[PDB]
Amino acid sequence: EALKAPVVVLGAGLASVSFVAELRQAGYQGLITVVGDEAERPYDRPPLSKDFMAHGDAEKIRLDCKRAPEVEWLLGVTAQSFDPQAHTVALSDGRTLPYGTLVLATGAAPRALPTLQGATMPVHTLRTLEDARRIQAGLRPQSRLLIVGGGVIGLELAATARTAGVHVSLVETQPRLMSRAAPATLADFVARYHAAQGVDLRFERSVTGSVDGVVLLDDGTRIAADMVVVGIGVLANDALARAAGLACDDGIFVDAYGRTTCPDVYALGDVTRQRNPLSGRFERIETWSNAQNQGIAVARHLVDPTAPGYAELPWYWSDQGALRIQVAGLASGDEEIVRGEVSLDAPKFTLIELQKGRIVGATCVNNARDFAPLRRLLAVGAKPDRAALADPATDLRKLAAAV
Ligand SMILES: Cc1cc2nc3c(=O)[nH]c(=O)nc-3n(C[C@H](O)[C@H](O)[C@H](O)COP(=O)(O)OP(=O)(O)OC[C@H]3O[C@@H](n4cnc5c(N)ncnc54)[C@H](O)[C@@H]3O)c2cc1C
């Protein structure tokens, strides 16, 4: 009923690939056409601040489009507009695509820093393979890099650059790192780790401008750098949706079926503003797991309307040198339980966030084994014995089973 052929998807990132693979796997055999503005074989972004930044082989980061047979991928083509009455999409190459169902999977773009508009020194953001190549081409040993923003991507780049023998300074407007999506205990530990690896961290500082290779701060001081990478967050790529009259606010509003306010138009991944089931509030979720899992859920329900809506709880990971960080659910509740010691000597620990005895979030540092059972406990809103949660004798995989 809702799934009308032909299917057109705008964007060829993870959300798009995951969606079209699930359409095919679920048994939809109609036309699928995907429009991607990047002239690149679809690829995954997490490597760009990690192993790619370090080793430079793009053929290790391509998405597997095997589970998406009989898809026409229009790469290097921009969707300029769509007409939701005519059920058409206008492309940059002069062609028009008809659709029965239109899927907006256009992701998000790094926010520019207004105070570095008209900088006369290298200022980059890190989103694309082209961005990663341009940054890597300036990552010379004993270079000076300034990162603006203490989000996970800036910190992943900081670790990669330090490992490469690059001097790194980092300016954060907040009093802590990872203010978006991380428990304070984690953010404090992570700052201690980066400081110990030689990152020059500047907290509660904002950039006010730049002059001849030097960045100016709002404490009236200067940081000289060979290169600036700005990581102050992203803005949804929701321009086509806004122009066509869909409900958007830095992100296209969708329900759990991926429906926008425009009939026959859906949206998925980083472009969307959606319900976080743990907070009960709408948020733009900026994670790999959301892009994949939302794309799959929306495709499954299009093919099989008896399937449930998207229901997965949020989580991400970050690889920052010696720290393999995993974070699920909410950053805080009324209670944090710490398993293990929080120590720079062989870091290994777990945080559990509870709200009235109920697990609402969890963090693992170098403890992948405990993250899977904690996500299962989170998913059913488990209320375990807080003494047991704290006790390192406790086996979390066992608790997961018991419930
Ligand atoms: C450097 C980096 C590291 C990351 N590391 C992690 C990590 O460790 N863990 C984690 O959970 N998440 C991580 N993420 C986040 C994760 O990669 C994103 O959540 C994910 O890429 C979102 O996928 P998407 O398909 O919704 O959007 P995107 O990947 O942005 O894909 C959308 C595509 O649509 C294109 N597009 C936009 N407008 C148009 C148009 N008009 N016409 C055609 N094409 C268009 C875009 O240019 C883009 O190619 C990282 C992201 C980056 C950039």
Author numbering: 4 to 406
Lines from the paper:
The long-wavelength beamline I23 at Diamond Light Source overcomes these limitations and extends the accessible wavelength range to λ = 5.9 Å. In this study, we report the determination of diverse protein structures by experimental phasing techniques carried out at long wavelengths on beamline I23 at Diamond Light Source using S, Ca, K, Cl, V, I, Cd, and P as anomalous scatterers. Native-SAD uses light atoms naturally occurring in proteins or bound to proteins. We demonstrate that long-wavelength native-SAD has become a very compelling technique, where a low multiplicity dataset from a single crystal can be sufficient for successful structure determination, making it a general vehicle of choice for experimental phasing.
The second method applies laser shaping of the crystal to remove all non-diffracting materials and define more regular path lengths through the crystals. Crystals of BphA4 complexed with FAD were shaped as spheres at SPring-8 (Japan) and collected at the phosphorus edge (λ = 5.76 Å) on beamline I23. At this wavelength, the anomalous signal from sulfur is negligible. Only the anomalous signal from the two phosphorus atoms of the FAD molecule was present to successfully phase BphA4, despite the low resolution of 3.7 Å (detector limited) and a low overall multiplicity of 12. Since the two phosphorus atoms are close to each other, they behave as a super-phosphorus with an anomalous peak height of 39.7 σ.
